[PDB]
Amino acid sequence: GHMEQTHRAIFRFVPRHEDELELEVDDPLLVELQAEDYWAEAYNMRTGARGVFPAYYAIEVTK
Amino acid sequence: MEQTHRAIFRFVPRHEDELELEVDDPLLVELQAEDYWAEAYNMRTGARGVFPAYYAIEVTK
C-alpha cells in the first residue's frame, strides 16, 4: 500500500548525533520501532529523513 | 549546588555525552543550549551530561 503516519512530533529536537532524526513541532512521523531504551526509530514525513529520537517527543495518532 | 529542574520522562543514553534520567530525578541544569539540549548534573546519580530539554521542568523556587 502506502506510508501511513503513526505519530506527530510535539517538541523540537535538533540532533547532536548522526543517528538522530530532526523534529519540528507538528512533524508527521512514521514510527518503525519503539526501542526498549525509550528511543523511537522513525521516518519524518515532512523531511524524508530517518533516524532516532527521544520517544516522549511524539504522540500516537491512530486514524 | 541546589536543584533547578526535575526530570519528567525516562531517558536512557545511546551516546557518550548523555545524562541518564529517571522520572522525578533532581537536576542542576548548567545550560539550556540553543539546540534544545540541556546540560546538567543529576543530583541523584552524580553524573553530568546532556539530555533533550523538554524532559525536565523547573522546580518551585
Author numbering:
A (entry chain AAA): 487 to 549
B (entry chain BBB): 489 to 549
List passages from the publication reporting this PDB structure.
Aromatic residues cluster in the core of folded proteins, where they stabilize the structure through multiple interactions. NMR studies in the 1970s demonstrated that aromatic side chains can undergo ring flips—that is, 180° rotations of the χ2 dihedral angle (Cβ–Cγ axis)—even when engaged in stabilizing interactions in the hydrophobic core. Here we capture ring flipping events of a buried tyrosine residue in the SH3 domain of the JNK-interacting protein 1 (JIP1). Our data therefore suggest that the conformation of the aromatic ring at position 526 is determined by steric interactions dictated by the size of the surrounding amino acids.
The data confirm that exchange contributions to the transverse relaxation are present for residues within three regions of the protein. These residues are located spatially close to tyrosine 526 (Y526). A mutation of Y526 to alanine (Y526A) shows no conformational exchange, and conserves the protein backbone conformation, as evidenced from its crystal structure that we obtained at 1.5-Å resolution. These results show that the relaxation dispersion that affects around 40% of the residues in the SH3 domain arises from a single exchange process, with Y526 being the origin of the observed exchange.
